[PDB]
Structures are given as structure tokens and as C-alpha cells.
């Protein structure tokens, strides 16, 4: 049959909050890191542990940001996060101006 919209989302929330394995596949993230680094200095090498540290920190930061964004959306009687939610969250955090 068919699951009603919004149920598999909750199931995925339960599934992912119980696990700790990273959610961005390694190689695209690594290539993004190398691209970003290149603009600051040429011909650079990275220790795999450094890439893992970056990935851990970024993923944790994004998860926290999404938590705050979800709180913002809920504050507006909403259930879908929208760009304005992220902007407000970062603004209050003091990251964005």
C-alpha cells in the first residue's frame, strides 16, 4: 500500500538519531574540502584524519543548526523549515550579520 505523507520522515528521524555514522559520503566532501583549500594555498596535502575531523565538525554544526532551524519554524506555527528560518537562527547566533 502507501504510507501517509510525514510518517516515513518520523521513522527516518528515529533511525538517524539512534546512529552516529556520518551522513555525507566521504569522497564528495573530501573533494569539496580540497577545492576550498586550494583557494588559500596551492599544492597542499591533507591527512585523512584531518579530513575526518573537518567532516565530523561540519556535520555536527549542521545538525545543531538544523535543530535551531526546526525550532524557529515551529515558533512560526510551521512544520517545514525555510531559508528565513536558517537566516534568523544564524542571525541570533551571531554568525551571519
Amino acid at each position: 500500500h502507501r504510507y501517509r505523507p510525514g510518517t516515513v520522515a518520523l521513522r527516518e528521524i528515529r533511525r538517524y538519531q539512534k546512529s552516529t555514522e556520518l551522513l555525507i559520503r566521504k569522497l564528495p566532501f573530501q573533494r569539496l574540502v580540497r577545492e576550498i583549500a586550494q583557494d588559500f594555498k596551492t599544492d597542499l596535502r591533507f591527512q585523512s584524519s584531518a579530513v575526518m575531523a573537518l567532516q565530523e565538525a561540519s556535520e555536527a554544526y549542521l545538525v545543531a543548526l538544523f535543530e535551531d532551524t526546526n525550532l524557529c519554524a515551529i515558533h512560526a506555527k510551521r512544520v517545514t523549515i525555510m531559508p528565513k528560518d536558517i537566516q534568523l537562527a544564524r542571525r541570533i547566533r551571531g554568525e551571519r550579520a
Binding site: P28, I36, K41
Partner: protein, 78 residues
């Protein structure tokens, strides 16, 4: 390159964050935010590496950079 951070990956990160419903423009906004964050952290890490006269950014550089930004990380030789 930046697009390699796939929409569904952002969906997984949000799910782990507790989000149920996601907007279309979110994905791109998240890509921008992640770009900025990586930019700052990697800038600091490189800065350290340059001062270390090494062509190989080390995990310690990343840890020191994250500490600078008030985002201390554990598990890589704190």
C-alpha cells in the same frame, strides 16, 4: 564540486537534526552555509600550517582552528 553535497544528504542531516518537512531552497542555503563554515575553519587551519612550514595540513591544525572558532572537537588528539 559544492553540488556534490547531495540534497538527500542534507535531508539525512536534517532528519538527524529533528526536521520533518524541508523546503526546496533549503538545500542551496545549507550548501552556502556549509561553504562559509568550511571556508573559515580551513582558512585558520591553513594559516597554522603555513606557520608550520609544511605542505601537509595536519589534523592538529584543524583542531586548533576549531578551537579558535569556539567549536572544540574531541577524538583527534585534543
Amino acid at each position: 564540486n559544492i553540488q556534490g553535497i547531495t540534497k538527500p544528504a542534507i535531508r539525512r542531516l536534517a532528519r538527524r537534526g529533528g526536521v520533518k518537512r524541508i523546503s526546496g531552497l533549503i538545500y542551496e542555503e545549507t550548501r552556502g552555509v556549509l561553504k562559509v563554515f568550511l571556508e573559515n575553519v580551513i582558512r585558520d587551519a591553513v594559516t597554522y600550517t603555513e606557520h608550520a612550514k609544511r605542505k601537509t595540513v595536519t589534523a592538529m591544525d584543524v583542531v586548533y582552528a576549531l578551537k579558535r572558532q569556539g567549536r572544540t572537537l574531541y577524538g583527534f588528539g585534543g
